[model samples]
Target: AGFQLNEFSSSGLGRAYSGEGAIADDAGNVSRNPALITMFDRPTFSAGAVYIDPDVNISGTSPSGRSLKADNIAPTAWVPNMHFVAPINDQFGWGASITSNYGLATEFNDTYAGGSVGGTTDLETMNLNLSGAYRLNNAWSFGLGFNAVYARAKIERFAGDLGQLVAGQIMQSPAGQTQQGQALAATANGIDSNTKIAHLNGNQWGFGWNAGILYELDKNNRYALTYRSEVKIDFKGNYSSDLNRAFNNYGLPIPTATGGATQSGYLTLNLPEMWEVSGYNRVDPQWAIHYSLAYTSWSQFQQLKATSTSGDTLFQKHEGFKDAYRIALGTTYYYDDNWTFRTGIAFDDSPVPAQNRSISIPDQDRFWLSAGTTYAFNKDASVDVGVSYMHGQSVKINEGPYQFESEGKAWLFGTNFNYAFHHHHHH
Candidate 1:
């Protein structure tokens, strides 16, 4: 899922979200296409949770030829979803959803020789949506929604081998002959490789909107076009680092640091917009097929820049992300009234090219294989379960003076409970 998440519902997970925009399996459908809510004849509620277990590893050598490796850099986490949709009439429907759209985490041992470039990084975000749908005609439906997004980010960098380099530079400088300079160099040399040289933490709220149009050619075939706007969040937080002071002590002027003390700063993060087109078709009484194509406007992400409260630029890292795409295909089999089966496959392209791949976000092209099942208890309730395996291509990355190879894969498990206020046996 890269930093963008897709774990909204077990029903969709099973189909690799192939036709999320056109399939109205439950209220969770509002997360992908609010217009689909109009397809529900009764009030419905859906809840689901997905667990992600990722196995991501990075290994290589530092600039000084020291071995650097970290296993399971990404952590295991859970994502949850809740949605409710109620049809007011044949023409109007409204719904609310709580879901997550973007998140990621990576960590390395503080003592890792490349800690300066690969320390600990985390990003978490949650979205609350309120939507309304209108049936314009027998074959047309339109949807609009408002989103309130909350996000938090944390980053920490360790000295590692960089500390030794700083010490050497200090000892060889012209100031080395002075007593104060020697004392400064001694302090730098005493710092452990595991010592934290920099740390940042922040959070904020942003607002955006989404719109969708659904066209139903018939009861058996449907298509949808969906769009979600971008959200801009300015994360205000404390930025602290000792490396600047070390560099200054060595007679190298660093512009971003006033001293070793903590300072207030803000980082602006733009959550890019997205567009998707999807279709669903039921060719027979027992078999169905669906597909989707999606695009993300990642080009807006040129750099991760942090600025101090006083207007000085504190830190800047180039990301230069490019646009990305995802394609999915899926099939469903209805064996009986109480049971259904599903399977799907998908390909997700990476937005970060090799030149911009950072250890904090080692993004790569990925493939997905998924399967799921649903069981109904009468007509009022049903449960869906899904499992998926994701494989990420191995790639070599060069970050400044560091060279490393990275490999990643993940397993996802999910389950959802769905209930309709009125018992209407329809699929």
Candidate 2:
């Protein structure tokens, strides 16, 4: 739930996306499992936005043995989604969706004590899907979709306390009196806590595909399995770092600068693959239940490396992520023809273990509690309101020269509007 977004629809938000692949309450289902589009009898449209307010803080001892703390590192964000579905016939359906599955934004003070390993990170991505669903028979349906994703990122790292560390080590070394060592120590001392060590901004587009299979035992009982392939994005941009000059002066064999001032570089990123098995069942006239089991191949994300056009390594960091998993259970109750209520609970496992967790992405296992309601104004229109809270388990992180205890939680609020067009449909 940290980076991978789950705020696509108010309807799904109510249940922590427990049975998304099997429930066709709104056109937003196109993002979860396109095969469910066949459940719609008429053209439908749904749009919504979720507001996320996160309160994440980190505190611990710096390498120099001083107390360190960063408050409200994560900011408030809004995620928007829109979907449309149309049925060509009883057996064929088409749908389109605009959504996002991965995103993150974090900011620490430029002079923060942990700035060496934590500064500012902003990564955003959007997905556009054009999908088709075929009802093979009463028992089975198949769906496939084409994905085009656009991503952009801006990252900044600061020297912070590291500057002092560098300066102190140099003064104690035998080369302190050497001519080159004097220049290196002066350069290191010139860099204060606010000095920017590195910065990069880049954008790119990538492509991928997804497929799903939905098996329906009845109109009210369904199960579905869905898979989304990984996408490879190559971001090209300019990278500048003050540390490059400092290291070069320190007798490190760093290559000469490129492109005059800024070094042209490429950062390759692989978005993870995902799969889910979800089920929906109506056991009684007034109550329905659903659940889902989901998995993400985060292990594919091993590092963040940027290389220059001339094959010189500009920046590199190990991520060492592991696969993550999620489980959810939810229930809905029908009170009247115009009103409905739902609630859910879920457990989400983190990909980054304690040892690998970084301040940039201090991920940890979390729990979700959500609730919402749907109100129908008439036969053709309805509105859904939902809210949820996520609590991240506190974890300890030891990155390079520092140690920290991190904890985070967030609140989500959203509303969705859905409308169905009553047009000509052959019975």
Model 2, 1-427: lDDT tens digits are 4478878899898988899899887899878897887888899999988998988999997866556698999999889999999998888989999998989998999988778788899889899999999998989899999999999898888866776677778888988888888778787777778767777789999999998999988899999999989888889977877554535434442233232257887888888898999999998888999899899998888887888888778777788888889999999887788998999999989988669889898678889999999999896999999999999789999988888999999899999999999966486
Best by TM-score, which number? Answer: 2
> lDDT values of the candidates?
0.85, 0.85
By summed lDDT, the worst window of 10 consecutive residues in model 2 runs over 251-260
The runs of at least 3 residues in candidate 2 whose Cα sits more than 4 Å from the true structure, single-residue gaps closed, are: 172-184, 243-246, 249-260
TM-score between candidate 1 and the true structure: 0.92
State the lDDT of candidate 1 residue by residue for 309-419, as single tens digits. 878776667888888999999998888989999999999898897788988897899898999999988778999999999997898988756788999999999999999
Clash number for every model? 0, 0
Question: What pairs collide in candidate 1?
Answer: none
